[PDB]
Amino acid sequence: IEVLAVRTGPDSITEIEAYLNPRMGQPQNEDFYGFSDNVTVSDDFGSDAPPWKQFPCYSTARISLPMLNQDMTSDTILMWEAISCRTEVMGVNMLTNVHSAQKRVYENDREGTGIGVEGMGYHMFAIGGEPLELQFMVFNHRATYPAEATVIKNPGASSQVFDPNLKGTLTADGVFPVEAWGPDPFKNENTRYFGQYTGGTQTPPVLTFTNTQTTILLDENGVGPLCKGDGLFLSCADIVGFFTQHNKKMSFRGLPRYFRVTLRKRVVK
Amino acid sequence: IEVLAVRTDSITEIEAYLNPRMGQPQNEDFYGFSDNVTVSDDFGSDAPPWKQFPCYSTARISLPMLNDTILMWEAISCRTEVMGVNMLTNVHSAQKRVYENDREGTGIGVEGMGYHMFAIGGEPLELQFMVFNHRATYPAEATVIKNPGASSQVFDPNLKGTLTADGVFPVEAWGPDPFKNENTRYFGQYTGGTQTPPVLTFTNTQTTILLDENGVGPLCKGDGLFLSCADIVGFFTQHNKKMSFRGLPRYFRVTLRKRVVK
Amino acid sequence: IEVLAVRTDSITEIEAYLNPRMGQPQNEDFYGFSDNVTVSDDFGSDAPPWKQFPCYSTARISLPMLNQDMTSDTILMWEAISCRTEVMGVNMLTNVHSAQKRVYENDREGTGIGVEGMGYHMFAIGGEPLELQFMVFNHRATYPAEATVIKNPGASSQVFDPNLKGTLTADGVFPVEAWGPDPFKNENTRYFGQYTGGTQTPPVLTFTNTQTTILLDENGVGPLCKGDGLFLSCADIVGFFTQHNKKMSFRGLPRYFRVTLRKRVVK
Amino acid sequence: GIEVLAVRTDSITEIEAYLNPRMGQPQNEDFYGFSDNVTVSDDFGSDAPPWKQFPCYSTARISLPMLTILMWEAISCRTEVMGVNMLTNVHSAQKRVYENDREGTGIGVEGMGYHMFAIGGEPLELQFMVFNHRATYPAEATVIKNPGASSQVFDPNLKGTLTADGVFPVEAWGPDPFKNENTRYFGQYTGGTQTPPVLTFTNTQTTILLDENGVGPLCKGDGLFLSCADIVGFFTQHNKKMSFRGLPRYFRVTLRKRVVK
Amino acid sequence: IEVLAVRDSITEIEAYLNPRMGQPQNEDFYGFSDNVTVSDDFGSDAPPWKQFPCYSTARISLPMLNTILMWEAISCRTEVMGVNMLTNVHSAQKRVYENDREGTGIGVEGMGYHMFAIGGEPLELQFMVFNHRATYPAEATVIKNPGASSQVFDPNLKGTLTADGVFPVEAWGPDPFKNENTRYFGQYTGGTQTPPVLTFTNTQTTILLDENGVGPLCKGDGLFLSCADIVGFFTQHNKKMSFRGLPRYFRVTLRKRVVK
Ligand SMILES: CC(=O)N[C@H]1[C@@H](O[C@H]2[C@@H](O)[C@@H](CO)O[C@@H](O[C@H]3[C@@H](O)[C@@H](CO)O[C@H](O[C@@H]4[C@H](O)[C@@H](O)[C@H](O[C@H]5[C@H](O)[C@@H](O)[C@H](O)O[C@@H]5CO)O[C@@H]4CO)[C@@H]3O)[C@@H]2NC(C)=O)O[C@H](CO)[C@H](O)[C@@H]1O
Ligand SMILES: CC(=O)N[C@H]1[C@@H](O[C@H]2[C@@H](O)[C@@H](CO)O[C@@H](O[C@H]3[C@@H](O)[C@@H](CO)O[C@H](O[C@@H]4[C@H](O)[C@@H](O)[C@H](O[C@H]5[C@H](O)[C@@H](O)[C@H](O)O[C@@H]5CO)O[C@@H]4CO)[C@@H]3O)[C@@H]2NC(C)=O)O[C@H](CO)[C@H](O)[C@@H]1O
Ligand SMILES: CC(=O)N[C@H]1[C@@H](O[C@H]2[C@@H](O)[C@@H](CO)O[C@@H](O[C@H]3[C@@H](O)[C@@H](CO)O[C@H](O[C@@H]4[C@H](O)[C@@H](O)[C@H](O)O[C@@H]4CO)[C@@H]3O)[C@@H]2NC(C)=O)O[C@H](CO)[C@H](O)[C@@H]1O
Ligand SMILES: CC(=O)N[C@H]1[C@@H](O[C@H]2[C@@H](O)[C@@H](CO)O[C@@H](O[C@H]3[C@@H](O)[C@@H](CO)O[C@H](O[C@@H]4[C@H](O)[C@@H](O)[C@H](O)O[C@@H]4CO)[C@@H]3O)[C@@H]2NC(C)=O)O[C@H](CO)[C@H](O)[C@@H]1O
Ligand SMILES: CC(=O)N[C@H]1[C@@H](O[C@H]2[C@@H](O)[C@@H](CO)O[C@@H](O[C@H]3[C@@H](O)[C@@H](CO)O[C@H](O[C@@H]4[C@H](O)[C@@H](O)[C@H](O)O[C@@H]4CO)[C@@H]3O)[C@@H]2NC(C)=O)O[C@H](CO)[C@H](O)[C@@H]1O
Ligand SMILES: [Mg+2]
Ligand SMILES: [Mg+2]
Ligand SMILES: [Mg+2]
Ligand SMILES: [Mg+2]
Ligand SMILES: [Mg+2]
């Protein structure tokens, strides 16, 4: 793509808003939607087979954009260029719930609040003009992922660190495990991604929300993601931490993510 | 609303406080606290009693009356402060001791989750309904969506509300709607856990600008300014290990100017 | 006050210390500490003994003569334009040998645990006394006669009650846990505060002579020194000191102030 | 002592590279990315950390295109720790949160973070310094032998350059601030054994490598020198045995032609 | 010292200050304190020599000069060196799972105290102690029998950092009432199980100019460097704890300044 002039004026700019619900593992429209199933742990890397529902996967959607009024006789085409976004983790308010079926602070005394959601936070989003380009990488290569998940089967010892053969693209919602795929910094020339990990099992979650924050999506040449086939590609994972039951069974809890994206008309060859 | 020129008498300032609504009734000995928190055994039998959970504070401030083309009050800046941070230096009032097994040491003080948010707009705060457990039965006193469905545990575009009453919208069931609130600025921070150290700052030297990307502040519909907040500081722990929410009141100063509208 | 021109002899600087008022008597062996903290069984029978809780430090500093224009309708006031402030004695918290509960008390071993727990650090610079809001954790707390409080303040005193006001007019007698800065007043004071809670929380303190804070408001006007007085207030709870027998006391540190003032004309 | 003249303009090039971590366990075998299980000595006197139980620095020389002489001058970089996503695994053979109840997630990776990278026109210049000078390092490791009590703090004689991948122990060597005129280095250490790892990743961050005179690293022999270490924390087995876990690091470097004397 | 114009004219010095944590230099525990013992009351409190850290300090000789010229310190780089060593969790450390004799060592944990000073004369100190009844040993420079007011600020209790390795950190800090010709910077993070957090780079330069554009002016052609760098505690299997310290790098850039 040879990139040419920005279009300005009051037809040249549009705004889309979208949500991505989390895919922590439990099925939609059922009582544990937003949670994983209770996590089971292997005894050894050789006998490691995490059941479907017990691990989070990436959220993704393609957003169909408004009609561009293309010039019928020009040797150029217009594309939508994503220039800025707002993104917010929604439902942070729910984490003030320390009554719902939670292990108590003073369990020996059957007293105190629930311990609430605690432990690892993994928060990442991507805005691009094509699917997010992935690097496959796993803690344990010998892990057997379920039929329901999309992974590289028998990926070999090299998949525990960087191996340039082990590539993917985030093409489906809810089936790419977070623990087996990450953004590929050798690609994503037409996507912006942002991620933060805070680990632990008892770490306090820290989340902010405001409707006053905007992130510019322009690269060093002042070019934003260019939406190929007039699609905008949104991706995220938002693990807030763990929910712990009275019997000490632990599940992942996720929150949905809001996106507002401003796009403008860019001429290309 | 089509926005025209700033009218440059044309500047006013309001100060207001919102007291916390942590659950216990006002003018009684536990005002500013919740009642002691009980925990359900399972999501299917989860009915948090009234007084045991915090709700949002809200107030509408009446502004000087104004009025082809109307004048509206435009919120351009604010100061906000969590008041009474000084009270948290109290480690003597009926608190579990650091060395309970020795009947020695200070109180452990207030500890655990901090949830701090405020909003300033020209109409009520627009809410998104979302809950940890959709099967929670909220008490008659609370404003909620009843039988909200599994979908309410994440984002459901059907589950909307507005913050139209003080002390009855449960914090755990409602948050700001980023799909709306074009005429409101909101800010919030959550720090989780039950033994987390509270971190609070206060100064009369910080001003936040409320103008959007187009230089437009909140425009006060019907000459009303809408202030909203929740300020959970953490939990108070008794000797017998019963735990309650403690809240603090919030100060607002808002500066407004007259703006011409079509 | 109607504020006019700034003079550019025009500038002066004062330095001062405020020593902490943690509860134990001055120039006795526990100076800089509270007495060992006791805890009530219920809010109804809560009566914290004098010495076992910290109080605000305040001083009024006398400023140099202003050399007024005898015939002018206007007067000169000192305007505070900037400060440095530093908690002094941070060096002392490297002490883990002085009568402290040990890290491994079951083995009678390791360093002392040193000072840990809540940090409350606030300072105020103004041209009149700091204006305070009364607010308490428990309204039924009976404060001792030595302390300045609103008596029988009632339930509303657990949150914001616009009736419950005061001003910081004496050093070492206004309990930190009962009074805070009033954001509805203090037009002529700048205040700054940080609270970090807990009882095992590590103290975090920084010190440098390279930091200046500007005291000018949004109009370019600093605090104006009425009666040619500069008013300094602070509290610097560093955390708790824990004895081998697990008795716990507040430890405080003194605060340094440098304030740059200039001559302002007013009407 | 290189006389630097004018910037050229064909005159700009970009490289991308990965450095795999060197935490101790051998490449292309089941524990790649990890150390072996850490053993602890009883005293400084009898302290011999076995090969495979401690991390070493990663390093690589990138061959630039061949070029008053011209040199490649490194003006900017992006760097990223990759595979942060894998740390969401709490099922792979990990001690459980509630071991006494055989319940909960794995405890995951926790403890010390040590994150450092260097980009230079010559090998990174090193200062030898150790917690305990009486440590006997294994034959596979590159160390100063019998370094003396002075090697527990700064001793100006104890110098080195990072000239080999995977054999300079992190606990024995660090960047020399007395040298490295032709290298930019950055690091952070967060200690503890139960500390939560904190890691960020984005493709949107650029670091300018120009010094206070507007000069970037000048690539001697048309080579670019990349170095790092990325200890994320410890992996803890059910039997409480602990290993280092590391992650690979991404480098993008932008270079331009500089005229030199 | 009335200051005139800036002015061959620019020089740069580098130096290191080794830590003075308490154990003798050139011996096996160099960089550590001896194992810390704890008193039962403030009355009987007498910390033995080697069990507490002291400030490090050096005077650097500048090219001799000489309407007089003076060396003016305008900027610096400083760096805690040897941060790399803290990745050692094998050297005679209490283990994470001591009941199971398993896990890594717990490594260095607890209070960090990091301070440096750059000036044209010795750092000016305020004497302040946790416990005034502490009897410091003969080897240490203190104010003897300082009294109850020494627990807080007493304006009589002053000193200057004139010797390396004998001013106890816990007895002396920088005096904000003086030090007009010194820039100091410090941070304290307390606790005994706190994680150390240390950063290092060769890319960071700090400007030493005051509000008037004047850097430290080196009286007698001497540059004064001071520091303390307590990283945390080393814990043995038997749970004996010592301070561990790290050396500090200094780069200072100086220019000639005319004075009267
Ligand atoms: C992640 C995973 O799947 N972990 C499972 C695995 O644990 C083993 C691995 O972590 C490997 C990785 O190198 O380390 C073993 O630990 C060994 C290893 O560190 C070794 C040196 O490389 O030192 C110790 O072992 C000692 C000695 O070197 C061993 O040869 C020896 O082995 C003997 C066994 O004890 C006998 O039972 C066997 O009959 O004969 C051999 C001798 O040929 O034991 C020495 C003991 O000090 C480390 O222990 C890990 N092993 C263990 C036990 O943690 O496999 C284990 C089960 O073995 C679990 O499934 C674990 O989840
Ligand atoms: C801060 C302070 O001074 N607190 C002291 C106080 O604690 C009580 C308060 O914290 C109040 C604040 O609401 O809450 C009590 O706990 C109750 C309460 O939360 C209640 C619902 O509002 O739920 C439980 O109580 C159950 C039931 O609702 C009660 O009616 C009941 O009451 C019976 C008692 O069991 C009998 O002993 C009594 O003689 O008869 C009544 C029946 O009318 O108990 C039910 C639970 O078994 C909560 O417990 C606080 N109470 C306690 C015990 O913590 O007063 C206590 C001593 O009572 C301490 O001094 C405390 O420091
Ligand atoms: C939050 C809440 O209301 N929890 C109460 C509930 O707990 C159960 C739920 O958390 C569900 C969520 O899917 O999990 C049950 O745990 C199960 C599942 O994770 C299951 C796989 O889907 O794996 C385990 O069960 C297996 C097997 O699948 C079962 O058929 C068999 O009966 O037991 C097997 C034992 O491994 C796992 O236990 C939760 N059950 C328990 C128990 O925690 O209901 C319980 C009481 O039953 C409590 O009321 C919770 O508070
Ligand atoms: C890192 C290491 O290898 N540690 C092993 C070492 O421990 C000893 C060292 O840590 C030295 C460092 O100076 O201290 C020993 O502790 C002694 C000293 O601190 C001493 C004052 O210098 O005070 C104590 O001892 C007194 C007396 O002073 C001694 O002379 C007398 O013999 O014993 C007295 C008993 O109170 C203090 O204990 C460390 N010793 C011990 C023990 O921890 O050597 C030990 C073997 O002893 C272990 O192998 C450590 O891992
Ligand atoms: C730092 C140090 O050297 N501490 C040693 C010291 O401890 C005593 C000091 O902390 C003083 C400081 O004021 O307080 C003692 O505790 C007392 C006081 O808080 C007192 C009120 O002022 O209240 C308690 O005492 C009451 C009563 O007032 C006493 O007269 C009566 O005998 O006991 C009452 C309680 O039952 C409180 O205990 C500290 N005393 C003790 C004990 O901790 O001296 C002790 C030995 O006495 C140790 O050496 C400490 O390390
Ligand atoms: Mg590329
Ligand atoms: Mg909208
Ligand atoms: Mg006012
Ligand atoms: Mg050099
Ligand atoms: Mg002075």
Tab-separated table of N, CA, C and O in Angstrom, chain D residues 38-41 44 47 112 129-131 133-134 149 152-154 170-171 173 177-178 180 183 185 187-191 193 240-242, chain E residues 16 18 27-28 30 32 79 83-88 90-93 95 100 102 104-105 195-202 234 237 244 249:
chain	number	residue	atom	x	y	z
D	38	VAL	N	17.047	-25.227	41.796
D	38	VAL	CA	18.132	-24.496	42.519
D	38	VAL	C	18.402	-25.196	43.847
D	38	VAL	O	17.444	-25.416	44.642
D	39	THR	N	19.675	-25.519	44.088
D	39	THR	CA	20.204	-25.970	45.398
D	39	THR	C	20.914	-24.805	46.088
D	39	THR	O	21.380	-23.896	45.387
D	40	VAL	N	20.976	-24.842	47.415
D	40	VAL	CA	21.518	-23.719	48.229
D	40	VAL	C	22.594	-24.267	49.149
D	40	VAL	O	22.334	-25.286	49.814
D	41	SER	N	23.749	-23.604	49.152
D	41	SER	CA	24.930	-23.982	49.969
D	41	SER	C	24.673	-23.645	51.429
D	41	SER	O	23.730	-22.859	51.713
D	44	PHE	N	29.405	-19.768	52.737
D	44	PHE	CA	30.112	-19.081	51.631
D	44	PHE	C	31.345	-19.906	51.224
D	44	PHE	O	31.761	-19.866	50.025
D	47	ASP	N	30.405	-23.341	48.498
D	47	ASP	CA	29.330	-22.705	47.697
D	47	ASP	C	29.696	-22.916	46.241
D	47	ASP	O	30.556	-22.201	45.747
D	112	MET	N	11.866	-12.852	41.834
D	112	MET	CA	12.705	-11.753	41.317
D	112	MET	C	12.528	-11.575	39.804
D	112	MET	O	12.409	-12.573	39.031
D	129	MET	N	31.307	-8.615	39.662
D	129	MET	CA	30.910	-8.379	41.070
D	129	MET	C	29.945	-9.491	41.476
D	129	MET	O	29.084	-9.879	40.630
D	130	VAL	N	30.159	-10.046	42.668
D	130	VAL	CA	29.467	-11.264	43.169
D	130	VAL	C	29.036	-11.017	44.596
D	130	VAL	O	29.702	-10.267	45.321
D	131	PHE	N	27.961	-11.682	44.998
D	131	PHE	CA	27.452	-11.707	46.374
D	131	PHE	C	28.511	-12.295	47.298
D	131	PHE	O	28.667	-11.722	48.404
D	133	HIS	N	32.523	-13.932	47.083
D	133	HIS	CA	33.749	-14.138	46.256
D	133	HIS	C	34.248	-15.593	46.326
D	133	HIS	O	34.878	-15.997	45.368
D	134	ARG	N	33.918	-16.333	47.381
D	134	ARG	CA	34.388	-17.736	47.610
D	134	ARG	C	33.528	-18.743	46.827
D	134	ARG	O	33.859	-19.971	46.862
D	149	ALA	N	38.199	-10.851	47.980
D	149	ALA	CA	37.137	-10.260	48.829
D	149	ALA	C	36.621	-8.954	48.209
D	149	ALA	O	35.415	-8.664	48.390
D	152	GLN	N	33.317	-8.550	45.977
D	152	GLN	CA	31.986	-8.420	46.622
D	152	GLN	C	31.500	-6.962	46.500
D	152	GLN	O	30.316	-6.715	46.677
D	153	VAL	N	32.407	-6.017	46.252
D	153	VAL	CA	32.081	-4.580	46.043
D	153	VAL	C	32.864	-4.176	44.802
D	153	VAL	O	33.059	-5.047	43.961
D	154	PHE	N	33.195	-2.906	44.590
D	154	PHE	CA	33.842	-2.495	43.329
D	154	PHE	C	35.361	-2.672	43.467
D	154	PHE	O	35.931	-2.118	44.435
D	170	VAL	N	24.802	-14.047	35.183
D	170	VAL	CA	24.168	-12.753	35.547
D	170	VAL	C	24.642	-12.390	36.957
D	170	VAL	O	25.017	-11.239	37.177
D	171	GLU	N	24.750	-13.355	37.864
D	171	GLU	CA	25.053	-13.048	39.283
D	171	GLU	C	26.534	-12.662	39.480
D	171	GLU	O	26.896	-12.313	40.632
D	173	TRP	N	28.403	-10.820	36.738
D	173	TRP	CA	28.785	-9.727	35.806
D	173	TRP	C	27.644	-8.715	35.643
D	173	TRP	O	26.471	-9.151	35.585
D	177	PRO	N	29.825	1.063	34.174
D	177	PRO	CA	29.517	2.473	33.890
D	177	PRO	C	30.768	3.334	33.620
D	177	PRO	O	30.635	4.455	33.132
D	178	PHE	N	31.946	2.808	33.967
D	178	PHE	CA	33.263	3.451	33.698
D	178	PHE	C	33.596	3.303	32.211
D	178	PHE	O	34.428	4.080	31.688
D	180	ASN	N	31.662	1.661	28.199
D	180	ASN	CA	30.396	1.574	27.425
D	180	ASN	C	30.076	2.943	26.831
D	180	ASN	O	28.906	3.291	26.747
D	183	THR	N	27.912	2.151	23.769
D	183	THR	CA	26.767	1.234	24.072
D	183	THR	C	25.755	1.962	24.959
D	183	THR	O	26.175	2.719	25.845
D	185	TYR	N	22.871	0.973	27.705
D	185	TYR	CA	22.307	-0.143	28.507
D	185	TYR	C	21.216	0.383	29.432
D	185	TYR	O	21.299	1.509	29.949
D	187	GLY	N	18.533	-1.359	32.666
D	187	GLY	CA	18.127	-2.490	33.514
D	187	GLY	C	17.223	-2.122	34.669
D	187	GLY	O	17.274	-0.978	35.158
D	188	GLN	N	16.496	-3.126	35.151
D	188	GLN	CA	15.715	-3.053	36.385
D	188	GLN	C	15.764	-4.416	37.088
D	188	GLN	O	15.588	-5.471	36.439
D	189	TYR	N	15.969	-4.359	38.394
D	189	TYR	CA	15.888	-5.503	39.316
D	189	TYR	C	14.736	-5.263	40.289
D	189	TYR	O	14.646	-4.178	40.907
D	190	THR	N	13.855	-6.258	40.413
D	190	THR	CA	12.862	-6.348	41.505
D	190	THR	C	13.114	-7.669	42.235
D	190	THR	O	13.007	-8.728	41.581
D	191	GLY	N	13.402	-7.613	43.538
D	191	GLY	CA	13.825	-8.798	44.308
D	191	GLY	C	12.653	-9.596	44.829
D	191	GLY	O	11.521	-9.333	44.431
D	193	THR	N	11.124	-13.626	46.404
D	193	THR	CA	10.819	-14.963	45.828
D	193	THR	C	9.312	-15.144	45.604
D	193	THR	O	8.948	-16.073	44.811
D	240	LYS	N	8.139	-28.373	45.979
D	240	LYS	CA	8.729	-27.081	46.454
D	240	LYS	C	10.099	-26.827	45.828
D	240	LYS	O	10.668	-25.771	46.122
D	241	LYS	N	10.550	-27.645	44.864
D	241	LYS	CA	11.756	-27.347	44.057
D	241	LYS	C	11.492	-26.144	43.144
D	241	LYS	O	10.426	-26.071	42.539
D	242	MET	N	12.449	-25.228	43.051
D	242	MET	CA	12.267	-23.951	42.323
D	242	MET	C	13.344	-23.812	41.259
D	242	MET	O	14.511	-24.174	41.506
E	16	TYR	N	34.343	5.979	42.294
E	16	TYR	CA	33.494	4.977	42.970
E	16	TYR	C	33.635	5.195	44.473
E	16	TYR	O	34.715	5.588	44.944
E	18	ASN	N	32.953	2.693	47.573
E	18	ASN	CA	32.581	1.391	48.159
E	18	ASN	C	31.741	1.617	49.398
E	18	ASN	O	31.906	2.602	50.149
E	27	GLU	N	38.441	-8.517	53.675
E	27	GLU	CA	38.113	-9.735	54.467
E	27	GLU	C	36.823	-10.324	53.866
E	27	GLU	O	36.246	-9.651	52.997
E	28	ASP	N	36.431	-11.544	54.260
E	28	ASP	CA	35.490	-12.390	53.467
E	28	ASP	C	34.071	-11.799	53.429
E	28	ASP	O	33.318	-12.211	52.539
E	30	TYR	N	33.295	-8.448	53.209
E	30	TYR	CA	33.379	-7.069	52.673
E	30	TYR	C	32.086	-6.802	51.899
E	30	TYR	O	31.750	-7.593	50.998
E	32	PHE	N	29.142	-6.446	53.598
E	32	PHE	CA	28.120	-6.824	54.590
E	32	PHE	C	28.463	-6.135	55.908
E	32	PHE	O	29.602	-5.755	56.081
E	79	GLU	N	25.207	5.834	39.571
E	79	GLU	CA	24.683	4.473	39.335
E	79	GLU	C	25.102	3.568	40.485
E	79	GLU	O	26.273	3.583	40.843
E	83	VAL	N	24.183	-4.489	40.823
E	83	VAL	CA	22.754	-4.909	40.986
E	83	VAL	C	22.618	-6.360	40.519
E	83	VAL	O	21.850	-7.127	41.152
E	84	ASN	N	23.353	-6.733	39.464
E	84	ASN	CA	23.414	-8.117	38.900
E	84	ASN	C	23.582	-9.191	39.991
E	84	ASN	O	23.021	-10.299	39.831
E	85	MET	N	24.275	-8.893	41.094
E	85	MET	CA	24.682	-9.909	42.094
E	85	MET	C	23.452	-10.437	42.849
E	85	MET	O	23.510	-11.560	43.452
E	86	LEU	N	22.361	-9.658	42.840
E	86	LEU	CA	21.154	-9.942	43.632
E	86	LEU	C	20.325	-11.046	42.975
E	86	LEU	O	19.380	-11.461	43.643
E	87	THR	N	20.740	-11.547	41.801
E	87	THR	CA	20.141	-12.731	41.129
E	87	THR	C	20.728	-14.012	41.776
E	87	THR	O	20.307	-15.102	41.404
E	88	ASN	N	21.636	-13.868	42.744
E	88	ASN	CA	22.214	-15.011	43.514
E	88	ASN	C	21.207	-15.455	44.562
E	88	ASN	O	21.009	-14.700	45.537
E	90	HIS	N	21.610	-18.859	45.756
E	90	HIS	CA	22.278	-20.135	46.167
E	90	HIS	C	23.274	-19.968	47.344
E	90	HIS	O	23.603	-21.004	48.031
E	91	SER	N	23.733	-18.758	47.658
E	91	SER	CA	24.897	-18.575	48.575
E	91	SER	C	24.458	-18.496	50.035
E	91	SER	O	24.255	-17.355	50.550
E	92	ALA	N	24.331	-19.658	50.705
E	92	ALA	CA	24.179	-19.753	52.177
E	92	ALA	C	22.984	-18.937	52.685
E	92	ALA	O	23.099	-18.342	53.772
E	93	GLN	N	21.848	-18.982	51.973
E	93	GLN	CA	20.619	-18.213	52.284
E	93	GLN	C	19.539	-19.110	52.892
E	93	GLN	O	19.363	-20.269	52.465
E	95	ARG	N	16.163	-20.754	53.027
E	95	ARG	CA	15.384	-21.179	51.837
E	95	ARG	C	13.922	-20.780	52.000
E	95	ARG	O	13.457	-20.592	53.150
E	100	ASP	N	10.937	-27.755	54.610
E	100	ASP	CA	11.113	-28.867	53.639
E	100	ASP	C	12.559	-28.917	53.130
E	100	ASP	O	12.803	-29.714	52.220
E	102	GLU	N	13.880	-26.922	51.090
E	102	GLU	CA	13.715	-26.860	49.615
E	102	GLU	C	13.468	-25.410	49.187
E	102	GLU	O	13.141	-24.581	50.058
E	104	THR	N	14.610	-21.950	46.390
E	104	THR	CA	15.781	-21.042	46.262
E	104	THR	C	16.086	-20.459	47.642
E	104	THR	O	15.263	-20.593	48.536
E	105	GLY	N	17.229	-19.813	47.783
E	105	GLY	CA	17.437	-18.830	48.859
E	105	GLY	C	16.414	-17.696	48.765
E	105	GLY	O	15.919	-17.419	47.637
E	195	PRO	N	10.730	-6.266	48.892
E	195	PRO	CA	11.555	-6.538	47.718
E	195	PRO	C	12.417	-5.342	47.330
E	195	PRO	O	11.906	-4.236	47.159
E	196	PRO	N	13.743	-5.494	47.171
E	196	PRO	CA	14.537	-4.419	46.610
E	196	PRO	C	14.121	-4.105	45.163
E	196	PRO	O	13.785	-4.997	44.391
E	197	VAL	N	14.183	-2.820	44.810
E	197	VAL	CA	13.913	-2.338	43.434
E	197	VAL	C	15.053	-1.406	43.045
E	197	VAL	O	15.200	-0.345	43.677
E	198	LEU	N	15.855	-1.806	42.075
E	198	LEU	CA	17.051	-1.049	41.649
E	198	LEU	C	17.033	-0.946	40.128
E	198	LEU	O	16.614	-1.932	39.485
E	199	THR	N	17.358	0.231	39.592
E	199	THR	CA	17.463	0.465	38.133
E	199	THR	C	18.896	0.895	37.827
E	199	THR	O	19.576	1.464	38.703
E	200	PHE	N	19.367	0.616	36.629
E	200	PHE	CA	20.701	1.077	36.178
E	200	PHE	C	20.580	1.389	34.692
E	200	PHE	O	19.858	0.676	33.945
E	201	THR	N	21.248	2.460	34.281
E	201	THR	CA	21.385	2.872	32.871
E	201	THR	C	22.596	3.806	32.775
E	201	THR	O	22.960	4.398	33.800
E	202	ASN	N	23.193	3.904	31.599
E	202	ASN	CA	24.242	4.915	31.312
E	202	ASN	C	23.598	6.100	30.557
E	202	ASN	O	24.335	6.990	30.086
E	234	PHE	N	20.806	-9.723	54.304
E	234	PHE	CA	21.210	-11.123	53.992
E	234	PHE	C	20.796	-11.986	55.168
E	234	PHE	O	21.189	-11.646	56.285
E	237	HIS	N	20.643	-19.414	57.013
E	237	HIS	CA	19.843	-20.589	57.437
E	237	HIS	C	19.444	-20.493	58.908
E	237	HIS	O	18.278	-20.830	59.240
E	244	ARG	N	23.462	-5.671	53.616
E	244	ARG	CA	24.245	-5.799	52.372
E	244	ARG	C	24.177	-4.472	51.605
E	244	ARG	O	23.076	-3.917	51.470
E	249	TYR	N	28.821	4.466	41.531
E	249	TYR	CA	29.576	5.180	40.477
E	249	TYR	C	29.162	6.654	40.496
E	249	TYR	O	27.936	6.951	40.637
